[PDB]
Design an enzyme around this catalytic site. Sequence first.
Site, PDB file in Angstrom:
ATOM      1  NE  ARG A 129      -5.737  -0.725  -0.486  1.00 15.85           N
ATOM      2  CZ  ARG A 129      -6.759  -1.300   0.132  1.00 15.85           C
ATOM      3  NH1 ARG A 129      -6.788  -2.625   0.313  1.00 15.85           N
ATOM      4  NH2 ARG A 129      -7.763  -0.552   0.545  1.00 15.85           N
ATOM      5  CG  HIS A 165      -2.052   0.939   1.154  1.00 15.40           C
ATOM      6  ND1 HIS A 165      -1.882   2.303   1.043  1.00 15.40           N
ATOM      7  CD2 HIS A 165      -3.383   0.732   1.266  1.00 15.40           C
ATOM      8  CE1 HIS A 165      -3.060   2.890   1.052  1.00 15.40           C
ATOM      9  NE2 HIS A 165      -3.990   1.960   1.180  1.00 15.40           N
ATOM     10  CE  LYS A 220      -8.929  -0.162  -2.273  1.00 15.11           C
ATOM     11  NZ  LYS A 220      -9.756   1.014  -1.942  1.00 15.11           N
ATOM     12  CG  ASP A 265      -6.365   9.891  -3.013  1.00  6.96           C
ATOM     13  OD1 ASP A 265      -6.136  11.127  -3.003  1.00  6.96           O
ATOM     14  OD2 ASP A 265      -6.694   9.276  -1.974  1.00  6.96           O
ATOM     15  CG  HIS A 315      -6.574  15.054  -0.490  1.00  6.24           C
ATOM     16  ND1 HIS A 315      -7.495  14.639   0.442  1.00  6.24           N
ATOM     17  CD2 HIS A 315      -6.075  13.936  -1.057  1.00  6.24           C
ATOM     18  CE1 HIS A 315      -7.573  13.321   0.422  1.00  6.24           C
ATOM     19  NE2 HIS A 315      -6.704  12.867  -0.466  1.00  6.24           N
ATOM     20  CB  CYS A 374      -3.087  12.148  -0.906  1.00 12.12           C
ATOM     21  SG  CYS A 374      -3.689  10.588  -0.559  1.00 12.12           S
ATOM     22  CE1 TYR A 375      -2.008   6.210  -1.330  1.00 10.28           C
ATOM     23  CE2 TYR A 375      -3.909   6.386  -2.762  1.00 10.28           C
ATOM     24  CZ  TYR A 375      -3.325   5.942  -1.619  1.00 10.28           C
ATOM     25  OH  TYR A 375      -4.028   5.192  -0.776  1.00 10.28           O
ATOM     26  CG  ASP A 404      -9.405  11.140  -3.391  1.00  9.62           C
ATOM     27  OD1 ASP A 404      -9.102  10.750  -4.515  1.00  9.62           O
ATOM     28  OD2 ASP A 404     -10.009  10.380  -2.611  1.00  9.62           O
ATOM     29  CG  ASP A 445      -8.842  16.879   2.430  1.00  6.71           C
ATOM     30  OD1 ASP A 445      -7.599  16.821   2.399  1.00  6.71           O
ATOM     31  OD2 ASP A 445      -9.581  15.997   1.940  1.00  6.71           O
TER      32      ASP A 445
HETATM   33  C1  3PZ Z   1     -12.322  12.322   4.448  1.00  2.00           C
HETATM   34  O1  3PZ Z   1     -12.722  12.171   5.877  1.00  2.00           O
HETATM   35  C2  3PZ Z   1     -11.651  11.719   6.587  1.00  2.00           C
HETATM   36  C3  3PZ Z   1     -11.216  10.410   6.393  1.00  2.00           C
HETATM   37  C4  3PZ Z   1     -10.121   9.949   7.104  1.00  2.00           C
HETATM   38  C5  3PZ Z   1      -9.464  10.815   7.970  1.00  2.00           C
HETATM   39  S1  3PZ Z   1      -8.079  10.229   8.821  1.00  2.00           S
HETATM   40  O2  3PZ Z   1      -8.253   8.734   8.955  1.00  2.00           O
HETATM   41  O3  3PZ Z   1      -8.160  10.831  10.222  1.00  2.00           O
HETATM   42  N1  3PZ Z   1      -6.427  10.605   8.000  1.00  2.00           N
HETATM   43  C6  3PZ Z   1      -5.990  11.926   7.469  1.00  2.00           C
HETATM   44  C7  3PZ Z   1      -6.856  12.502   6.399  1.00  2.00           C
HETATM   45  C8  3PZ Z   1      -6.996  13.852   6.573  1.00  2.00           C
HETATM   46  C9  3PZ Z   1      -7.785  14.568   5.703  1.00  2.00           C
HETATM   47  C10 3PZ Z   1      -7.900  15.982   5.943  1.00  2.00           C
HETATM   48  N2  3PZ Z   1      -7.914  17.104   6.180  1.00  2.00           N
HETATM   49  C11 3PZ Z   1      -8.414  13.917   4.632  1.00  2.00           C
HETATM   50  C12 3PZ Z   1      -8.268  12.558   4.441  1.00  2.00           C
HETATM   51  C13 3PZ Z   1      -7.499  11.839   5.358  1.00  2.00           C
HETATM   52  N3  3PZ Z   1      -7.290  10.534   5.122  1.00  2.00           N
HETATM   53  C14 3PZ Z   1      -8.191   9.677   4.403  1.00  2.00           C
HETATM   54  C15 3PZ Z   1      -7.836   9.807   2.932  1.00  2.00           C
HETATM   55  C16 3PZ Z   1      -6.887  10.550   2.384  1.00  2.00           C
HETATM   56  N4  3PZ Z   1      -6.958  10.375   1.077  1.00  2.00           N
HETATM   57  C17 3PZ Z   1      -7.947   9.517   0.803  1.00  2.00           C
HETATM   58  N5  3PZ Z   1      -8.475   9.175   1.958  1.00  2.00           N
HETATM   59  C18 3PZ Z   1      -9.649   8.244   2.183  1.00  2.00           C
HETATM   60  C19 3PZ Z   1      -6.012   9.938   5.553  1.00  2.00           C
HETATM   61  C20 3PZ Z   1      -6.062   9.526   7.029  1.00  2.00           C
HETATM   62  C21 3PZ Z   1      -4.767   8.840   7.508  1.00  2.00           C
HETATM   63  C22 3PZ Z   1      -3.459   9.622   7.462  1.00  2.00           C
HETATM   64  C23 3PZ Z   1      -3.060  10.414   8.529  1.00  2.00           C
HETATM   65  C24 3PZ Z   1      -1.847  11.100   8.477  1.00  2.00           C
HETATM   66  C25 3PZ Z   1      -1.002  10.980   7.373  1.00  2.00           C
HETATM   67  C26 3PZ Z   1      -1.383  10.156   6.313  1.00  2.00           C
HETATM   68  C27 3PZ Z   1      -2.615   9.482   6.369  1.00  2.00           C
HETATM   69  C28 3PZ Z   1      -9.904  12.120   8.185  1.00  2.00           C
HETATM   70  C29 3PZ Z   1     -10.993  12.568   7.462  1.00  2.00           C
HETATM   71  C1  FPP Z   2       4.015   9.450   8.590  1.00  2.55           C
HETATM   72  C2  FPP Z   2       2.666   8.727   8.418  1.00  2.55           C
HETATM   73  C3  FPP Z   2       1.853   8.430   9.689  1.00  2.55           C
HETATM   74  C4  FPP Z   2       2.208   8.348   7.139  1.00  2.55           C
HETATM   75  C5  FPP Z   2       1.007   7.666   6.807  1.00  2.55           C
HETATM   76  C6  FPP Z   2       0.906   7.450   5.331  1.00  2.55           C
HETATM   77  C7  FPP Z   2      -0.320   6.710   4.857  1.00  2.55           C
HETATM   78  C8  FPP Z   2      -0.909   5.572   5.645  1.00  2.55           C
HETATM   79  C9  FPP Z   2      -0.905   7.136   3.661  1.00  2.55           C
HETATM   80  C10 FPP Z   2      -2.022   6.648   2.971  1.00  2.55           C
HETATM   81  C11 FPP Z   2      -3.324   7.306   3.435  1.00  2.55           C
HETATM   82  C12 FPP Z   2      -4.532   6.870   2.624  1.00  2.55           C
HETATM   83  C13 FPP Z   2      -4.844   7.577   1.325  1.00  2.55           C
HETATM   84  C14 FPP Z   2      -5.335   5.846   3.085  1.00  2.55           C
HETATM   85  C15 FPP Z   2      -6.468   5.336   2.444  1.00  2.55           C
HETATM   86  O1  FPP Z   2      -6.636   3.891   2.596  1.00  2.55           O
HETATM   87  P1  FPP Z   2      -7.781   3.276   1.646  1.00  2.55           P
HETATM   88  O2  FPP Z   2      -7.671   1.808   1.692  1.00  2.55           O
HETATM   89  O3  FPP Z   2      -9.086   3.946   1.838  1.00  2.55           O
HETATM   90  O4  FPP Z   2      -7.207   3.937   0.315  1.00  2.55           O
HETATM   91  P2  FPP Z   2      -6.963   3.178  -1.044  1.00  2.55           P
HETATM   92  O5  FPP Z   2      -8.258   2.895  -1.673  1.00  2.55           O
HETATM   93  O6  FPP Z   2      -6.068   4.283  -1.788  1.00  2.55           O
HETATM   94  O7  FPP Z   2      -5.944   2.008  -0.848  1.00  2.55           O
HETATM   95 ZN    ZN Z   3      -6.004  10.844  -0.767  1.00  6.23          ZN
END
Ligand code: 3PZ
Ligand code: FPP
Ligand code: ZN
Lengths: 403, 315
Positions: A271, A228, A274, A277, A342, A279-280, A332, A339
């Site tokens: 992945r 992932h 999938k 997005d 992103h 953020c990748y 995304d 947000d």
């Molecule tokens: C969209 O409602 C949400 C969903 C999940 C989360 S969360 O689980 O607390 N977190 C942080 C995060 C922050 C924001 C913002 N502002 C937006 C999304 C997002 N995601 C979810 C996401 C991002 N890209 C696609 N997806 C589905 C990552 C996640 C985990 C993470 C934390 C720190 C560093 C990397 C990854 C917060 C809000």
């Molecule tokens: C330093 C630190 C704590 C880094 C964390 C990095 C990290 C876990 C990034 C990915 C976040 C993300 C888009 C998750 C979504 O999972 P999903 O299964 O919904 O998304 P998918 O469909 O893209 O696989």
């Molecule tokens: Zn994303």
Amino acid sequence: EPLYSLRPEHARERLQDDSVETVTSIEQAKVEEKIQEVFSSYKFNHLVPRLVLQREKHFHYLKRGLRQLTDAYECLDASRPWLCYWILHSLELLDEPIPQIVATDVCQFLELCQSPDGGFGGGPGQYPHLAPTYAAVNALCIIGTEEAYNVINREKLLQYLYSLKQPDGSFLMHVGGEVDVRSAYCAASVASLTNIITPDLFEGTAEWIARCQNWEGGIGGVPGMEAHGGYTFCGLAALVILKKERSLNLKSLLQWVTSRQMRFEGGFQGRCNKLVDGCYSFWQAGLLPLLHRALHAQGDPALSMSHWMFHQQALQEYILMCCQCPAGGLLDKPGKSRDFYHTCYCLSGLSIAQHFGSGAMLHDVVMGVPENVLQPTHPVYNIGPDKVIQATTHFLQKPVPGF
Amino acid sequence: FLSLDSPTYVLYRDRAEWADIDPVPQNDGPSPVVQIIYSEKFRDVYDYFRAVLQRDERSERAFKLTRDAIELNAANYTVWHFRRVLLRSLQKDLQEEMNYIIAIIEEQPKNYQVWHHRRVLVEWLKDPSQELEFIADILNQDAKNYHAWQHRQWVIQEFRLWDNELQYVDQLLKEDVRNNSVWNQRHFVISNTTGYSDRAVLEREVQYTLEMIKLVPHNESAWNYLKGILQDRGLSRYPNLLNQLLDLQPSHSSPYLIAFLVDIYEDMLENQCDNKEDILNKALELCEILAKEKDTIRKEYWRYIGRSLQSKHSR
Ligand SMILES: COc1ccc(S(=O)(=O)N2Cc3cc(C#N)ccc3N(Cc3cncn3C)C[C@H]2Cc2ccccc2)cc1
Ligand SMILES: CC(C)=CCC/C(C)=C/CC/C(C)=C/COP(=O)(O)OP(=O)(O)O
Ligand SMILES: [Zn+2]
């Protein structure tokens, strides 16, 4: 001519569903269908495409967020230092300076998030966790004023970090939490920037990380998990930091990332099978500047000295066409809401895609207007390579404080 | 007992039960940053949560308050921590708590804390009996939920519940053969039960992948699987493989086929095979068909693959 995504050859990179419809195929087609609508809108409207990074709109968005968030962000109420990080990094990327004023208010805020026993919690009086510790440290370094550096209690931080180290190399996310590759990265990132690394701190850690590399090429969150996007970054960036880049099958990894770019959309999926997005743009594409420094430091003479091993142009086109909110902020994918997350990672990924470095060779690729160029980002810490210099330089002026 | 969604829901500051305790406002400082404008409801729960936390009040009321605090921000690991302190102090029936977490995961299956909390309970109870059916239900609504796979892997390993899982795979692969989580699980089982470096199974496996890749030639997952279960032996130790792909180049073509054909030649070349200088052609070629025509998103990858070869297989 001149945009990759708009070329007529590009109609071909659409999804062939074999005639065999599943959930996976149906959902990708939905996305491709939306993305095609974006790519095509210039033609259908009869204008010339011109790709512009809505800097000033993004800047007002981040400026305001840095001080106040809607109750949309109640779900990130235990992630406040992440918000500081995301917003302050996006601003540094957009070359918008941080008022000495705000610097000092981030500082005092993060002090409040600092735990007595070390680490940072997700807001005042929250217990410490490594994720907000990482965010805190990075945001402190972005600010880079002595006041910001002085917030960090390195003794305690080193204590906290030991409290989380496990037998088998891994690190707990927080006390009475569980392990994950993310936590070794947060540990490795914060340990280095602040210089509190000891010989035995990361002892075990690389081999635990290599256990996470799966049969696909990428890294999963713990051994046996599917590969992932953001977890792969964490592992490699963790290794790079330790210098164990060694331990992975870098060729199998290189090859996994590269397959993650979507032939139609231009961005990356996290992945296999999938959806794209933005953020990748950072988590997946930020692997190449790490795989470069690595495959290089292992003599690979077939490496490019102009470009990273992903389609820099199409990534920029995805980000610039599909991931911008007109009101400022990034997303995304189209149809989603802005947000600050992103915004941070689309911009950080935009920067990577724009700037090739390699020991000596600096080369830029800036889609659209010249004003689109962002300030560079360090692919390990995802802060400015300057803020890193200025941080580590400092924390070597101090000795590694043990417990 | 009193639900956050109830029309009768009342703020904690208006509750008789709670009069003795003074809310603790958030210490955000003189001039806040990333200050969230909480709903009055959110602010109210968390003002009282802070009160019960700072006092370390181990009560039935602090327990119920964690429920609401969780519903409002289930990523709040400080609350979850305090809740587990409370489950243990108050000697709460952990099946009832297990019932609660079932329900919360069902509502927020993408939250990490909630799964973590379920593992802890499973470990406290040392009872896996509800898990596979539970996880199966989450997978029935999102079959690629990462945490759900991670909890399944954990359960299966820690308590050795392998025996019906490849059956689960097949079920799911046949629902959606494109699900990379299910391919990954297939590999998780096999390598944890029978094995691949076996000779007889490496072969029902290698077999079955080709039969899916025939049904859905542009399914990257299968190709990565097939590639997955051979690449570490060496793809060139299976010579029939090559000829058998070279059958479908006219009828089932894909960039994955060509991409795979190339991995073989590298392996072939890396071992001194027959036609080192010759094979180096069929491949170098294929890199440019990929970089220029069939897989241009990876041109930078392929231009480098055509050329690390030269670097090493030249002269
Ligand atoms: C969209 O409602 C949400 C969903 C999940 C989360 S969360 O689980 O607390 N977190 C942080 C995060 C922050 C924001 C913002 N502002 C937006 C999304 C997002 N995601 C979810 C996401 C991002 N890209 C696609 N997806 C589905 C990552 C996640 C985990 C993470 C934390 C720190 C560093 C990397 C990854 C917060 C809000
Ligand atoms: C330093 C630190 C704590 C880094 C964390 C990095 C990290 C876990 C990034 C990915 C976040 C993300 C888009 C998750 C979504 O999972 P999903 O299964 O919904 O998304 P998918 O469909 O893209 O696989
Ligand atoms: Zn994303």
